[PDB]
Symmetry: D2
Subunit: 261 residues, 4 copies
Amino acid sequence: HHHHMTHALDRFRLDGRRALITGSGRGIGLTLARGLAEAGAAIVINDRNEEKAATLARRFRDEGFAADHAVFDVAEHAQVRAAIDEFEARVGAIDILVNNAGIQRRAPLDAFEPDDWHALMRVNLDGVFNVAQAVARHMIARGHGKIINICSVQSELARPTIAPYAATKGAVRMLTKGMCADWARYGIQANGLAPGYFETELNRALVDDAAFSDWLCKRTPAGRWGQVDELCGAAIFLASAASDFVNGQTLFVDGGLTSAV
Amino acid sequence: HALDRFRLDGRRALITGSGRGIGLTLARGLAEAGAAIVINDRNEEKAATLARRFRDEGFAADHAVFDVAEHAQVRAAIDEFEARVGAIDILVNNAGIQRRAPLDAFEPDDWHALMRVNLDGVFNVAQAVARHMIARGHGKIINICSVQSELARPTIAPYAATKGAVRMLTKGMCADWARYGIQANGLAPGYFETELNRALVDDAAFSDWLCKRTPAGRWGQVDELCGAAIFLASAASDFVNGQTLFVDGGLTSAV
Amino acid sequence: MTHALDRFRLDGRRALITGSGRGIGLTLARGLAEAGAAIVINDRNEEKAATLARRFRDEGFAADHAVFDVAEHAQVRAAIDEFEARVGAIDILVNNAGIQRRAPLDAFEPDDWHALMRVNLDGVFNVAQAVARHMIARGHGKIINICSVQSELARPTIAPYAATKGAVRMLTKGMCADWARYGIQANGLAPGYFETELNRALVDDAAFSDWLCKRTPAGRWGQVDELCGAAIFLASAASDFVNGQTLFVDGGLTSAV
Amino acid sequence: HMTHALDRFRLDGRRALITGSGRGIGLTLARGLAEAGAAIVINDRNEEKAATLARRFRDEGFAADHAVFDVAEHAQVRAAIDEFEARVGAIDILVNNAGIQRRAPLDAFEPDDWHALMRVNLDGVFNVAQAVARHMIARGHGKIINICSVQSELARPTIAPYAATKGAVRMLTKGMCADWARYGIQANGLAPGYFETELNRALVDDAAFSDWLCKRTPAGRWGQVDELCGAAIFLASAASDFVNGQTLFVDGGLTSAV
Ligand SMILES: NC(=O)c1ccc[n+]([C@@H]2O[C@H](COP(=O)([O-])OP(=O)(O)OC[C@H]3O[C@@H](n4cnc5c(N)ncnc54)[C@H](OP(=O)(O)O)[C@@H]3O)[C@@H](O)[C@H]2O)c1
Ligand SMILES: NC(=O)c1ccc[n+]([C@@H]2O[C@H](COP(=O)([O-])OP(=O)(O)OC[C@H]3O[C@@H](n4cnc5c(N)ncnc54)[C@H](OP(=O)(O)O)[C@@H]3O)[C@@H](O)[C@H]2O)c1
Ligand SMILES: NC(=O)c1ccc[n+]([C@@H]2O[C@H](COP(=O)([O-])OP(=O)(O)OC[C@H]3O[C@@H](n4cnc5c(N)ncnc54)[C@H](OP(=O)(O)O)[C@@H]3O)[C@@H](O)[C@H]2O)c1
Ligand SMILES: NC(=O)c1ccc[n+]([C@@H]2O[C@H](COP(=O)([O-])OP(=O)(O)OC[C@H]3O[C@@H](n4cnc5c(N)ncnc54)[C@H](OP(=O)(O)O)[C@@H]3O)[C@@H](O)[C@H]2O)c1
């Protein structure tokens, strides 16, 4: 007689949406690209290397996903705009942007090399502006879009030797609020996704350091490293209609680290 | 099967103060995601009849009667429910009240009433349920916060104190209970048309101010809170702990 | 040519410090008196408060006392109104009285929950409301609410205390929202870790101290005199455009993982 | 008593460098710090402006010198700081004040304006803090005060890139604390609300903005620049020796309220 229905849960589906993930040739970006595709999105692989991005997109199509690619260095403003505009003209609309590309360089701030400072600013901060601006012109024209900026625990709490990275991630957290202030009126939700400590290549030296890992497990209420699949749920949520009234916020996925001494 | 990340099959959610308002909306949303739900009201006939209407709509639904402000009464009702109906795996601490006046004019009875419902009540129900969640080694606790967990508005300083308290109490639940497989998080709504906010909805000047103050340019609609609640109740948020997620159309991110 | 520095002087101002019979409150009372304030010692014990005020006077300070339990709303209001009329205006309020009770939240006794709420949260409301009525009417006043690291970051076994201190941090913003228009600056002062009787169990535990020193960028416990500068600043004209804020004095603890 | 209490805040025997102190908040803070007893160093990109101001402070009875550099030029800053330390002496207090503002909706924002903001407001803080901190760390004491903004916390339309720079500076401040508190450095932020300087000329001249601001601010008014001196002296003095990694907002209540 009765029929159980699922309206509030169905709003998590991404069917009919296209997501571009910057730096999705490997790492968290590739993990999130697959998670968003599984949730129904067409995806766009981004890498600086054309052959790599095109081949990865083809492997997604072999698995039945809708996938394409867009080649650019996020730090190159004009190059990014040309690639985004060409993709919109030839392929179609980008409805979700995940600003994932990023790098890490560790040293005490008094010894930090200026070239390392500059490289971090170009990728982690200039890059987020370059791709968001280029995509947002098209989202504004359509009156809807999602922008998800990958942040960090260092958007809130500092650690020794990574002061420049923390500067870039505090910048992205505020740039996210600024995207909301300028674009919420056009139906765009711009939010931050801040992972805690995840076992990945960016952090391999930390994972392999027994002293650091012992400290991290005591420091984190959850008592462990995160694993990258644990970010997919948050990314899907922020990309979906289920979060249409979430805007300007940064969601920390860190096992409780930022909530505790 | 990507939606499976967010499904609540086999879990039961209790929503305090779910006879009307946001609590009723969240109960429906969690049930649609697959949870069995528990209606809470201080009036047994109202709670039980609402649960019956959920069951008529194909949802698994029961009820539990208590005033969240009464510590021993809550514990007795939660323990009785756990023994007679079954495990509560998700707790939404939603019951709350509002009383507005400049702080220099605030009546101590109103101060006390806000503290009892919005702050004691979160402790009373969370402690009673968490004893059982700890024994099972898993649970979700979602505490309903507010914009006033972060930004103050004139005439609601005592409410803001309760919602700042609940935001920190949420971090404290994580600190004590993450080791037992419990994730405790806050969900802070912006502005929604419920009876809590009747005076604001009916004030054209306030509504005009709110639409300019909110980047999204409008009031929220209560169903826009279900996604965040389902996320924080599901395995999709198992590595989210001690956080408060604001669902406010951008209000707290902007001047 | 010292204008900007004379903005820290408190001459001509009177400061009430709740719970100033011992601990941080007594330290802050002395610090404010040294900066020129007349001070009011508060304790629940009439003889203790009277003795402390007399000894401050013996050292050349202007001091009086006002006896009340911060948790008792009517008793606080009566004592504040009586003092305002008999002795004179209170221009600075330091809401310092507070308690701590530690236990895992699932075992927390409701009597201990209630005690923490009554002192740490009701108490701040009770004294702030009573004093602010007078300050608002005069058009000037400073309210300084003593917060904690637990206004922002939790620690196991002190979730109820954290609730009270998160409440006080937001109540501070609400005081600003209602009262800044009347010339009141209401701000929070959040100490990090200090060796008072509040924290005796922590001071006495070398493993806790080892954790704290490694957790704190400054690498040490604070010393209670290191709180006086912040209190004088927030009590003085030097902070007339600071409002609704909570200043953490914690050696960097809350800024770091 | 009074000597003991004011002693907390006195800056006698200390030297403060204020970047971009040719005008605006930086010049006001330079005067406030000198009034509290500090020897001061005026910084401007133009030698004749910095030299003239430093002489004017000396004519008024203050100890004052000048150091010319563009905060955005890493190697130039390093050479200028090291030369000042070698020839004149220790810099004990650094106020990273130099900054600019460029306003446009983000989708129309010019890359040249984005880059200008990053170079001054973010690179510049790194460039001068690194150069000075090397000396402070070696001595085992120092104060760094980074000028932030309401936009270190709350966004406003048309200034998203500036907000990015000020969120960056707020976190960089925490990073300075994490790396250098162990060496006796206190690094903190001072975030002004709204003040009538040339930075904000377009806002002062916009009656609708001013109307909005006075309603938005619990204090109900613009700040006056002298209201920032107290916070700067506090963060430069012994009174703040256990304050580290924090950003103090001086904004009349703005960031605390809806
Ligand atoms: N625990 C964590 O790992 C963690 C925690 C918090 C935040 N995050 C953030 O998560 C994001 C992804 O990090 P990850 O851990 O996946 O690091 P990763 O394994 O090192 O991957 C970084 C990705 O960014 C790409 N990339 C770098 N510079 C680029 C540029 N100029 N243009 C285009 N793509 C570029 C890389 O491509 P190439 O192969 O060409 O190098 C790679 O695909 C970053 O923003 C990082 O800050 C990570
Ligand atoms: N825009 C918004 O509405 C908004 C924004 C931010 C936060 N919130 C929060 O959302 C929650 C729900 O509020 P609402 O807007 O839905 O308000 P509402 O329509 O007034 O509903 C409040 C609910 O709580 C119940 N309740 C009150 N005191 C209770 C007690 N002692 N024991 C048990 N139940 C009790 C009420 O039951 P009765 O029918 O018996 O009165 C009612 O079901 C509250 O925590 C509120 O602070 C709301
Ligand atoms: N590291 C720290 O010590 C630390 C850190 C952060 C925040 N704090 C805060 O700093 C404040 C002072 O704490 P403390 O460290 O100085 O603690 P303490 O040594 O235990 O002193 C607490 C003071 O409050 C008084 N008090 C307690 N309940 C009272 C009541 N009902 N009415 C009036 N006075 C009452 C006590 O008087 P009796 O002698 O009658 O008990 C005593 O003078 C508290 O708000 C505390 O939360 C302390
Ligand atoms: N309400 C406010 O005014 C307000 C609010 C919040 C934060 N702030 C911050 O306060 C600081 C001072 O701003 P303000 O209001 O005083 O602005 P202002 O009147 O425009 O002054 C800015 C100062 O920085 C200097 N400067 C700019 N770029 C420089 C560079 N590359 N190298 C060296 N000096 C440089 C300027 O020198 P020139 O004379 O050569 O241009 C000028 O002396 C900035 O960091 C600003 O973001 C201001």
